[PDB]
């Protein structure tokens, strides 16, 4: 595999000629189709002596609820959408910008113990009571996700590069956009 532009036709339509044997730095490597399963992380040596971690069947990931800066390590359940290819959804392939299902248990535990309000020692409650009044009720779109137990999340990392599946929860019009795609 190589990434050189010598094998391509010119912009005018001309066909380039053979110049040199394949170079080591213009490679070029086999893609890793990360999916859902028991963890397999392979490591590959790179040009600077650095190391790249290939993700093969990742199961758990670190996800961010940005509306209040709460991030928890949850379980990736199933890929629901992918703008690139529909076949990546069917085989449950994990790549960047993929809409997935994740467990809502760690986020519900934090929300209940921080605001003291349902989602489906006198100093403590007023500490929680003041927090709820300042913030307000969660968006209904995020509400219906919670009682079903699974949250929409977009993966923002590169599992084939860093070996980690990280992302953030859908919320706002971005959530509404992907819900239209899923129906």
């Amino acid at each position: 595999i190589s990434r050189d532009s010598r094998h391509k036709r010119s912009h005018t339509g001309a066909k380039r000629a053979y110049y040199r044997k394949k170079r080591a730095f213009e490679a070029g490597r086999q893609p890793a189709n990360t999916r859902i399963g028991a963890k397999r992380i392979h490591t590959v040596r790179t040009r600077g002596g650095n190391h790249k971690y290939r993700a093969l069947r990742l199961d758990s990931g670190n996800f961010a609820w940005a509306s209040e800066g709460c991030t928890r390590k949850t379980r990736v359940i199933v890929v629901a959408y992918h703008p690139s290819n529909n076949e990546l959804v069917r085989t449950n392939t994990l790549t960047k910008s993929a809409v997935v299902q994740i467990d809502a248990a760690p986020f519900r535990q934090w929300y209940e113990a921080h605001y003291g309000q349902p989602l489906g020692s006198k100093s403590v409650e007023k500490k929680q009571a003041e927090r709820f009044a300042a913030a307000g009720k969660v968006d209904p779109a995020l509400e219906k996700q919670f009682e079903a137990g699974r949250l929409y999340a977009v993966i923002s990392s590169r599992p084939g590069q860093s070996g980690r599946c990280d992302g953030y929860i859908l919320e706002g019009e971005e959530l509404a956009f992907y819900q239209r795609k899923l129906h």
């Binding site: 532009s5 912009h11 703008p83 971005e174 956009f177 992907y178």
Partner: protein
Amino acid sequence: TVQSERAFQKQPHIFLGGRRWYKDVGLGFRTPAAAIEGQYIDKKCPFTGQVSIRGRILSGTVVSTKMHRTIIIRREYLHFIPKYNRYEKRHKNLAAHVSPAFRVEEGDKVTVGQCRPLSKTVRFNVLRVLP
């Protein structure tokens, strides 16, 4: 429509400080009003995108706009030839990305600035439109 595609668009790290992002490319070019007040999305626009402008600043005449967000520039120039003391009418065709901020037709004169390789051919971004 802005969200006329298969993925949400776009601005990467502008979480919904809370306002639409833009910058100035420097070198005396003024950011178009469309970029400031527009809802369009383009990751290769010199103002609303991540792309920086550095290198050579050229100009020419717009020839074709049948593309999507890229135009072709004709750069007429005269080539001097010793042994004859005359010139030749030569020309080159240049590919440059055009941001949705400008309304450009064929025959207009534009100024482009060098950026990183955006595609197989494009290495320049439209900065100003004269007419």
